[PDB]
Design a protein around this ligand. Structure first.
Ligand code: MG
Ligand code: MG
Ligand code: MG
Ligand code: MG
Ligand code: MG
Ligand code: MG
Ligand code: MG
Ligand code: MG
Ligand code: MG
Ligand code: MG
Ligand code: MG
Ligand code: MG
Ligand code: ZN
Lengths: 206, 36, 172, 143, 59
RNA sequence: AUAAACGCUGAAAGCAUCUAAGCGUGAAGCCCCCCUCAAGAUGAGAUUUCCCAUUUCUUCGGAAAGUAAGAUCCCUGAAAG
RNA sequence: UGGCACCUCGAUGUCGGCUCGUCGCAUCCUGGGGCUGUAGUCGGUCCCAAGGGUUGGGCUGUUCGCCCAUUAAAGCGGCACG
């Protein structure tokens, strides 16, 4: 089990050896450093803590640069934890490269979806419209709120609200090419998020 | 297996038992299996 | 009527420290944890069994307990033998080292091994014997082997016991 | 006129350890719910908390008479449509022996703000060892 | 008063009902208001009355 | 771990018996595995790091008034609204 | 389908369809079994099981029904005949 953090760069396509054409997603994963190791005797669970991008010393604050100073590194921008990981490796202060993966590896992609604002029921929940003619006045409305007996409306009655901006995991994605020199990972398909969004690449759990 | 409220022997070789607090009969003839 | 007059003929020496009736013998060793409510009196030949009160609960445990001391001493000294047979075309049965391969007619071989204290052997390519000093274990294992392909009535094919009146039904 | 009424902090509250092995679930809980309430003291005042602190150990060895280990069901609804969940008494004693004792005692306490304060006074441990040795608790024998 | 005389009587190996039976049997006519007063303020005298009640129940 | 069901050993009730004690299999169902929220879980949890022990008053509980680490008002904005 | 006339006449909107569902099991499909006048492929009947699923049209205001063509299946009911 391995894991890195990266930034969603964009989408393109490549030609395989058969001549087949596939879509890929470009992820740049430079400057990964191991910060802290968590064990059972101190925390009750085992994890490894990773920082992705260093930032200017002005943006950092006093508490932050005392935590990265234990690993002898510049303060980082994104920090995440990975579980189900062998703690025998991952010495403190080491560099995590994209070479931990290889062509053909199956991974999982975790990210935060693109933001949609206040949205209605038939876009947010994929419901149906009413007739647009024949005298109807019901086009894009939620529906009946329920029966009369309870004197109330039940929970989980789907209604308009804020739509996007939520964490999504996409499973069983293939790796097409790894470029250690450019610190670039090519993943076949889609990953959640907009451009420049943080993506958490981890080996497949199944 | 017959699930009826009137479990009773059907031949001479039928035997009546109680398994897990339920009246039933067992017999060499599989057509004679009953359970209340 | 009767659930008494037990025998412990040689080759055995129980050492029941309340419940752990450890019975030694040439074949092996067997132990369990009889409920510490009824009487046990290990002697040179007999282990006296009796009930404090003559109630339905004690009448059942009197017969049950004694009947399985006789099971150990027979098993731990002489043992138990369970015999099995196979009927059907291409129903080969053979042993490879320790495991059992049965070609009962499925698309894959069926695999079986015997637990500790149980010995499984194949003298001929169409019969199986389960050997051991524990009646509960020997009888249980042979049931699983027979459960692979029970004898269907129309042609009688399948794993069957030697003494087994298979109800053969006419088919056509 | 002249009848003694206790004041908060006027009565001394003690710490007790109760061994809960072999005793029935409801026989123990009824006895405990009177110690927390303070009904064993002549200083008892209905509107004041004068009870004692109770620690229960060996909660995994509590007794369940008859077929209660499999036939007694504990229900739980999440206020969502069709969100009823159930557990058995025997299955909960093995996994969460602490929750079984607090569910029993909580129903034997007054259902108001003060009775909600007496529940914060009970500590249940599934094993034989507790962590309140600093309070120097005593051993209480059931009646 | 009753729930408070009961608590003090159980410290003398007695219940409230047995205490009340003994007092009336022996002839003491003190009511609940004052028996509860002794159980809180002058517990020493409450044990004196509990001895008279215990003896009357034993002839 | 179980439901219906199938068995082993086994007495009550010298036989018989899947049952009383004791064991083994056994469902798209139950509890887990998978995804998401979640410490206001007033039971308010845990780890790493940063700042420190100022000055005036009170009769005591204590108060106010400059600050440290840190954050904001205000301003340029979008990947957010 | 009815019997009664207990709340409502200082107002409790009444069929069918649309949008949105949720519950019961006396289970239509899928899952596990016993009996069979169960050779195999198909079936009949009963037991456990409510996890998911359960079509598009012609005629009629129609619920219902018949028909066309599919489907693993085109379940029966309650929620002021939601
Ligand atoms: Mg319009
Ligand atoms: Mg905290
Ligand atoms: Mg721009
Ligand atoms: Mg009517
Ligand atoms: Mg009238
Ligand atoms: Mg009105
Ligand atoms: Mg009206
Ligand atoms: Mg109105
Ligand atoms: Mg009308
Ligand atoms: Mg049913
Ligand atoms: Mg069938
Ligand atoms: Mg209606
Ligand atoms: Zn018969």
């Amino acid at each position: 089990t391995k894991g890195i953090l990266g930034r969603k760069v964009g989408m393109t396509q490549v030609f395989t050896e058969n001549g087949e054409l596939i879509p890929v997603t470009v992820i740049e994963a430079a400057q990964n450093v191991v910060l802290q190791k968590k064990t059972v005797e101190t925390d009750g669970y085992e994890a490894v803590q990773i920082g992705f991008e260093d930032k200017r010393a002005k943006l950092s604050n006093k508490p932050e640069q005392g935590h990265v100073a234990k690993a002898d590194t510049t303060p980082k921008r994104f920090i995440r934890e990975f579980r189900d990981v062998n703690l025998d490796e991952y010495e403190i202060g080491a560099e995590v490269k994209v070479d931990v993966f290889a062509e053909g590896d199956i991974i999982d992609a975790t990210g935060v979806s693109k933001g949609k604002g206040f949205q209605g029921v038939i876009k947010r929940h994929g419901q149906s419209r009413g007739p647009m003619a024949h005298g109807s006045r019901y086009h894009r409305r939620p529906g009946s709120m329920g029966p009369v007996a309870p004197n109330r409306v039940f929970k989980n009655k789907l209604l308009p609200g804020r739509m996007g901006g939520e964490q999504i995991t996409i499973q069983n994605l293939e790796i097409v090419k790894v470029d250690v020199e450019k610190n670039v990972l090519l993943v076949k398909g889609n990953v959640p998020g907009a451009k420049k969004a943080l993506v958490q690449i981890k080996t497949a759990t199944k | 297996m017959k699930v009826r409220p009137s479990v009773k022997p059907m031949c001479e070789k039928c035997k009546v038992i109680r398994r897990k607090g339920k009246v039933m009969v067992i017999c060499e003839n599989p057509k004679h299996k009953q359970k209340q | 009527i009767g659930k008494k007059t037990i025998v412990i003929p040689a080759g055995v020496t129980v050492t029941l420290n309340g419940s752990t009736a450890t019975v030694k013998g040439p074949k092996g060793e067997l132990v369990k944890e009889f409920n510490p409510e009824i009487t046990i009196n290990i002697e040179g030949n007999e282990i006296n069994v009796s009930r404090p009160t003559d109630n339905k609960n004690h009448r059942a445990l009197h017969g049950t307990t004694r009947a399985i001391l006789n099971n150990m001493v027979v098993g731990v000294s002489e043992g138990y033998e369970k015999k099995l047979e196979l009927i059907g075309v291409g129903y080969r049965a053979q042993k490879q080292g320790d495991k059992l391969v049965l070609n009962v007619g499925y698309s894959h071989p069926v695999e079986f091994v015997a637990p500790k204290g149980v010995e499984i052997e194949v003298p001929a390519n169409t019969q199986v014997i389960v050997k051991g000093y524990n009646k509960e274990h020997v009888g249980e294992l042979a049931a699983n082997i027979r459960a692979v392909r029970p004898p269907e009535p129309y042609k009688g094919k399948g794993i069957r016991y030697e003494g087994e009146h298979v109800r053969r039904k006419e088919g056509k | 006129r002249t009848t003694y009424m206790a004041k908060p902090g006027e009565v001394e509250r003690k710490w007790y350890v109760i061994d809960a092995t072999g005793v029935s679930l409801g026989r123990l809980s009824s006895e405990v719910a009177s110690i927390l309430r303070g009904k064993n003291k002549p200083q008892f005042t209905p509107h004041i908390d004068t009870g004692d602190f109770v620690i229960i150990i060996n909660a995994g060895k509590i007794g369940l008479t008859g077929k209660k280990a499999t036939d007694k069901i504990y229900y739980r609804h999440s206020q969502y449509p069709g969100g009823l969940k159930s557990r058995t008494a025997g299955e909960m004693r093995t996994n969460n022996p602490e929750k079984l004792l607090e569910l029993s005692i909580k129903g034997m306490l007054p259902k108001n703000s003060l009775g909600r304060q007496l529940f914060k006074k009970l500590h249940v441990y599934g094993g034989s060892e507790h962590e309140h040795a600093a309070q120097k608790p005593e051993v209480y024998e059931l009646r | 008063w009753i729930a408070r005389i009961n608590a003090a009587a159980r410290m003398q190996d007695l219940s409230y009902s047995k205490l009340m039976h003994g007092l009336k049997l022996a002839g003491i006519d003190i009511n609940r208001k004052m028996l509860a007063d002794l159980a809180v303020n002058d517990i020493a005298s409450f044990n004196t009355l509990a001895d008279s009640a215990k003896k009357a129940l034993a002839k």
